[PDB]
């Protein structure tokens, strides 16, 4: 808190920046717990106040119910409210929120199968298509394409994509069958 106050009140001091890099670790550790607000001080000036934020308080704050309450409060103030009473409504909301946050901390005391089936279907059905390449049996295809033919080349070009489409159909069928098996 001392170092943060010094750095923020003197942003252009290299000698203090050196100490900031020296204390980077401690400042990083205490960053979540360091609170910072600005107030109109007694000297008729804006003063910056540093305090401690607790881990329990922060967790209770990011509890989803408190977030929904915050959204409702902001909506109500913005829509139906005046700037003269905004800071009174805000303090009332803060008091109610603090009470419910403390009560929650008080009371709080001490599909995967569907995804895996689809992945297995992908693996199996793709391996079925790759088995033709793995057979290394295209010597017959090479022997029949010894004769350089545009018709044969176009036929093979279409046949590869037709095989891919048939493999996709098999994969979809396998996924559906696995879905029925799982739900049953």
């Amino acid at each position: 808190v001392l170092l943060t106050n010094l750095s923020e009140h003197m942003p252009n001091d290299t000698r203090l920046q050196t100490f900031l890099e020296l204390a980077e670790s401690v400042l990083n550790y205490f960053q979540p717990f360091l609170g910072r607000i600005e107030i109109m001080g007694s000297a008729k000036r804006i003063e910056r106040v540093y305090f401690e934020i607790s881990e329990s308080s922060r967790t209770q704050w990011e509890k989803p119910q408190v977030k929904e309450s915050k959204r409702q409060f902001i909506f109500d103030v913005v829509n139906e409210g005046g700037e003269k009473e905004k800071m009174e409504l805000f303090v009332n909301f803060c008091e109610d929120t603090i009470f419910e946050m403390q009560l929650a901390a008080q009371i709080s005391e001490s599909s995967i199968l569907t995804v895996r089936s689809a992945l297995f279907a992908l693996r199996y059905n793709i391996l079925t298509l790759m088995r033709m390449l793995s057979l290394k049996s295209l010597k017959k295809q090479m022997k029949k394409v010894k004769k350089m033919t545009v018709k044969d080349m176009v036929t093979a070009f279409f046949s590869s994509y037709w095989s891919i489409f048939m493999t996709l159909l098999h994969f979809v069928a396998s996924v559906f069958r696995g879905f029925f098996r799982i739900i049953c």
Partner: peptide, 18 residues
């Protein structure tokens, strides 16, 4: 290529065209 074909199969537009 196996991973590529898996991505293509899981692609929505390719499924629509199929």
């Amino acid at each position: 290529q196996m991973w590529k074909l898996g991505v293509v199969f899981t692609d929505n537009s390719f499924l629509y065209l199929a």
